[PDB]
């Protein structure tokens, strides 16, 4: 039903990219938003000339909203999605979908029972690099060894939700989502070993550093290392995504990529996350206005959630 009236829960990168396209597209209208922190809420309201709702609960219950975009504090995503679906809203999330596989399945069933969209993508984190990997995996043959490491030194560690044990949640959730979206080629994860180490702040509800490591064995033979570290103890940053195959190696350093085959080295064109967010937003608008089905289905985010549960279980986490 046009225009699609949108409320945005969140003010970060994913929320801003969605807001830009919702505004620009004539099939949609940005009505309200909610932010968790005072300064970023003010900036978002100014950029997009939309007034903020004081609570996200009020936003999702607004009768002048058709669609809720969720891209906020990690812990909140499942609860906000369930509340929005119960209020008869369509829901689009930036991954995570929920805290547990069971909640993700409960959300999937609820959206079906209400006949509402439940759509999840994972674009903000290395979305362009992921498509570049997809476009070039066919070139390197059987992938047997991959390493995805994100190390971000930060001193002092802030007292915000990203360093808060409960709000941030299991630290490997986002990284494991990235490594799990090649099931089409790697098969499913068959074995997991994972460790998680924290450096607590004086207030033990916050950590000042974390190092989480997951070592995965896939069914088609791939051994993958997935590393997530941030905080006060890290003196060298690292943003590496390397995949070794018997016909070549793909190396991504940040958003920079290079194909290596024999003695040749080729630059890899990495597209913008802005373009990927726009195509996804326009596909969502297509579905809501003409019923044309989305190419993405919830199964990819559900499996990433399963992998996260499995690695947390291997960690003794929660």
Residue numbers in the entry: 8 to 325
Please give the exact wording used by the authors of the publication that reports this structure:
In this study, we used a cyanobacterial BVR from Synechocystis sp. BVR catalyses the reduction of the C10 double bond (γ-methene bridge) of BV using NAD(P)H to produce BR, a reaction in which the hydride (H−: a proton and two electrons) is donated by NAD(P)H. Syn BVR is composed of 328 residues and shares more than 20% sequence identity with rat and human BVR proteins.
We determined the crystal structure of Syn BVR by the single isomorphous replacement method coupled with anomalous scattering method using an Au-derivative crystal. The structure of apo-Syn BVR was refined at 2.1 Å resolution to R and Rfree values of 0.200 and 0.239, respectively. The asymmetric unit contains two BVR molecules. Although the electron density for apo-Syn BVR was mostly of high quality and continuous, the densities for the N-terminal region (residues 1–8) and C-terminal region (residues 326–328) were poorly defined. Therefore, these residues were not included in the model. Comparisons between the apo-form and the NADP+-bound form revealed small but significant structural rearrangements upon NADP+ binding: the N-terminal domain shifted ∼1.0 Å in order to expand the active site, and the loop between β5 and a part of helix α6 (residues 129–135) moved ∼2.0 Å away from the nicotinamide ring of the bound NADP+. In the apo-form, the guanidine group of Arg185 in helix α8 formed a hydrogen bond with the carbonyl oxygen of His129 in the loop.
